[PDB]
Design a protein around this ligand. Sequence first.
Ligand SMILES: *Cc1c(COP(=O)(O)O)cnc(C)c1O
Ligand SMILES: *Cc1c(COP(=O)(O)O)cnc(C)c1O
Lengths: 393, 390
Amino acid sequence: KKLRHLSDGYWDSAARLGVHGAVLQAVPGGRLSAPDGRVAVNMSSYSYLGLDESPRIIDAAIAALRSNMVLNSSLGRVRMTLPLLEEAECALGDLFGADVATLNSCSAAAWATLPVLASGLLTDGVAPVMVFDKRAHFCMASLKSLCADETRVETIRHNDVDALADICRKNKRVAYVCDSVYSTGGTLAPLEELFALQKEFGLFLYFDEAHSTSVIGDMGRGYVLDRMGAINDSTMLITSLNKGFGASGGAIVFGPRDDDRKRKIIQRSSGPLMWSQRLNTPALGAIIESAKLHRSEALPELQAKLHSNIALFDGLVRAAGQGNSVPIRYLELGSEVDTLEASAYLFDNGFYVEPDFFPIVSRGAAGLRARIRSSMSTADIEQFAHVWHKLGV
Amino acid sequence: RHLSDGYWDSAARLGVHGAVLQAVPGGRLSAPDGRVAVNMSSYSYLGLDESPRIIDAAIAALRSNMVLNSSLGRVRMTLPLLEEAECALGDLFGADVATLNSCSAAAWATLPVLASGLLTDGVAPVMVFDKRAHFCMASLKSLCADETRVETIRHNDVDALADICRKNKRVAYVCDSVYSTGGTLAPLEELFALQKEFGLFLYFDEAHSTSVIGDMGRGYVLDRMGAINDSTMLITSLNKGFGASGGAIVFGPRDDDRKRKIIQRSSGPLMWSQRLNTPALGAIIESAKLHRSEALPELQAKLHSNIALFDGLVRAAGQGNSVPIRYLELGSEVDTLEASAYLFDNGFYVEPDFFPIVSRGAAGLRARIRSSMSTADIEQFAHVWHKLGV
Ligand SMILES: *Cc1c(COP(=O)(O)O)cnc(C)c1O
Ligand SMILES: *Cc1c(COP(=O)(O)O)cnc(C)c1O
C-alpha cells in the first residue's frame, strides 16, 4: 500500500546521506575509501574471519585464472567440467566430510534444491510436507510457491518445535526448512530438538548455513556439522562462500560423501544446477585455497581472534546480541530518521555501520547492524566505542 | 524418468556426459589419456573465452583491487570497478544495466516484480509466457501467479497474444529473443506492433542473442528496435559469447532510474544475493571495449562464414539460419549416445541431447558454431561425420 511512500523516503534519505549506494574502494584493514579520499572502518562487513583480505586466497584465485586461461569452468558450458572444478568440490567435500557441489550463489543452491525436496525425489519418493520457519532467509522462503506445486507447504512460528512435532505425527514425511544462524533475532536453530524429531520421525532437515560456516565449529564446518559430527542422509545444507569463507559463490552439502544419489537426482533436475553457469576459475581457485586454510591451524587462530573481538566489543558497547558468540550486533535506535543520521554521523567520524530501516526491519525498530570480524584491531573497536558514546552526548 | 536416468548413466559411462577435461587453446579439450578433441558444442560463440585481452583484464582487475567481492563485505555499497562495468554495459546497449551473478538471478529478481505491476504503473499485467521460454523464467510462473494471472500461449502465437491485449488493460509477454531448440526467433515486427498499439510489455531473454546478433553485438531486439523504450526489458547471460561472467538486467532507457530503484528495493536476488567478483567485472569492462571496437564485426564475419561452411557440408536442423545453433537429429537415444562417443574418439565433442533434455525419440547432437573454429576444423568434422554413415 502507501507505506511504499514511507519506505521510498527512507531509501531516498539513506542515499542522500551517503549511507547507502556509495562508490567506495576496498582499503587494506577492513577499511573503505571514498572519492574525497576519506577512510572509514567497515563495522558491517560480512567477511567474519577477514579472509577477504587473505593474500593466500587472492593469489590462488589469480593463479587458477592464469594457469587455466579460461574464465568459465565448464568447457564452453557443455556438460563437462575442468579439473579445477572437481578439485574445488573435492576440497569442500574433504573439509565438510560430505558430498558437496558449488554454484554461483547460495540463492542458486536453494532454487536447485527446494523444488526437488518438495517433489519427493530426495525422500524415497514420498513428497514431504515442506515446513518453513517464519524467519527463513528469503532465498528459501520466496520459493514456497514452487514447493506448493509439488506438495503441501506450511509455515510455523520461529523455532516452534512443538508445532513441527505435531506435523510430524500427522504425516508420513516432513521436511523442515530453516537457517542455522539467524542474522536478526540473534537466535539459533534448535539443533537438539530438531535432531530428536529427525531420530523419532525421520524428519528431513534443510539448513541455510551462510552465517554459520567459517565462524562456527572445528575447521569452520559450521553450527550443524559441529554438533552433528558426520552428516547423515536426512540432512542437507546450503551455504554462501563469500561471507567469511572468503571466496565466491555458494554450495550444496548433499549428504554423506559415499552416496552419489542426492547429487545425481538434483543434477538431473531442471534447476540452476543444470542450466545456470558454474563458478569462474578465480572463484574456484579461491575456494581450494580457503579449504586448505580452513583445515590448517589458521582457522582456529582466526576464530580465537574473532571471539576476542566479540568480547572486546561487548565489553565496550551494549547492543542486541551482547554475550552471543555469533558476531552480529544490533544497535537499535528505533527511529528510521535517527538511525540514518546516526549512520551518517559515524561515517563522517571514520566508521561505516549499515542502517536497517523499514522495509528491511519493522517500522519503529530501525537500527545499526554491526558485524564483528577477525581483521578488526583492538584500536578499531575501542575507537568505535569512543565515537559511539560521544554521539550519545 | 527411470529410463531418462538410465540414459544419463550410459552417457556418463560412455564418457560423453560428466567427464573431466582440460580447456585446450583453439576450442579444444584434452582428456586424461591425452586425447585432444575439438569442442563443437561450446557456447562461446565469438571465441571470446580465449581472448587474451579479456583474460588479462580479469587478472588485472583482481590484482589492483586485491579483493574478490565487488561489494564492501556485502554492505550496500559498491567498488568503483562495479560501477565502471555497469557503465560500460550501459554505453554498449544504450540503457540502464545492472550486473548479477547469473542470468537466472536476473530472471528471479525481475519477473516477480513485473508480475506485481510495480513496473507497469501499479497495474498488475497479465503475465503471458511463450511455450518455449527458457526454464530460468518459466520455472518462476508460480511466483508470478501469486501476483496476477499467468498464461502460457503456443510458441510465437502472436494472434493469441493480440487477443489477450484486446481483452486486458495491461499485458506483458515473456519470451526468448533467440530460441536454442527449434532455431526460431521472436517475431519482433508483430511484438512491436502490439506494443505500439496496446502498450504490451516485452520481456526478452537475450542469452543466445548478445554478441552474436547486431551491430556492436547489442543483440537481436536492440538491433531492430534501435533504442530501448520504457516498455521493454532484457535479461541476458554474459558468459556465452560476451566472453565474461555473470548476467545482466537491461532495465530500460539510460535516463530513467525508476525501474532500477524499484528492482533494487524489492525483496530479490538483486538485493540479497552476492554481486559478481572482481575478475568477472574486469572481464565485462574489457569485453565491452571489444564490443565497441572493430574486432566485434570481424568476429561476426568469421562466425557467419563458419556457419555457411558448416551448412554446406552438413545437413542439420537449423540449416540456413543465421543463429549458430544446429541439431543433428538421430532419434534413437542410444544412437545419439554412440554417435557422440564415436565422434569424440575421432576428435570432435558434440553434446548428446537425450530424454529428458528432449522428447523421447528426438535425441540428437547439439552443435554450436563459433568464431574460433578454423575452416580445417569444420571440414575435418564433416568428414568424420559422413564417415559415420559407414
Ligand atoms: C544460459 C541461459 C540462461 C541461464 O544463464 P545463466 O547466466 O547461466 O544463469 C537463461 N536463458 C537462456 C536462454 C540461456 O541460454
Ligand atoms: C548470504 C545469505 C544468503 C544469500 O547468499 P548468496 O550467496 O549471495 O546467494 C542466503 N541465506 C542467508 C542466511 C544469507 O545470509
